[PDB]
Design a binder for this molecule. Sequence first.
Ligand SMILES: [Cl-]
Length: 175
Amino acid sequence: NLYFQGSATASELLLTAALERIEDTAQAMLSTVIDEERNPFLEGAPSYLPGKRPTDVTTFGQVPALRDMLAESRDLEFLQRVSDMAGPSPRIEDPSEEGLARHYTNVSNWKAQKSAHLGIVDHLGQFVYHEGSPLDVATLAKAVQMWKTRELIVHAHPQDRARFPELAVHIPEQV
Ligand SMILES: [Cl-]
């Protein structure tokens, strides 16, 4: 309306082959974690299930890729990029039901982007995910989320690749 200026979000205008590949891979990893109940962060994608998992791997800290991303998620430069992508807190564009509807969506999306990583905190300000975190469906799904997040950051800012190195991911010869 007249005295209302909506908040805009950062975007990749085109679905380039690079971006599609990030998406397709992220999806495969999610499939690996949730469908296959396997860990795409270790060579051969071993199970994470008690009874099937590697005897000596039961926590985030015992998986190098996850120990790495845990540290990145505490990094100010990473968190800055997440804020840059998510943008500022959403501001309603129009004081109307349609405006409010769009605002709802903007707020959901913003929250979604802000917390798509392993460095988020609980209601007491403590990190939800740490080196002692179990490898399970929820924790690994979050790790895959962060994998996508860091790859989207690097696509947008290629020079950030040096800071957030490529990590090997392992998709079952099935998926
Ligand atoms: Cl507002």
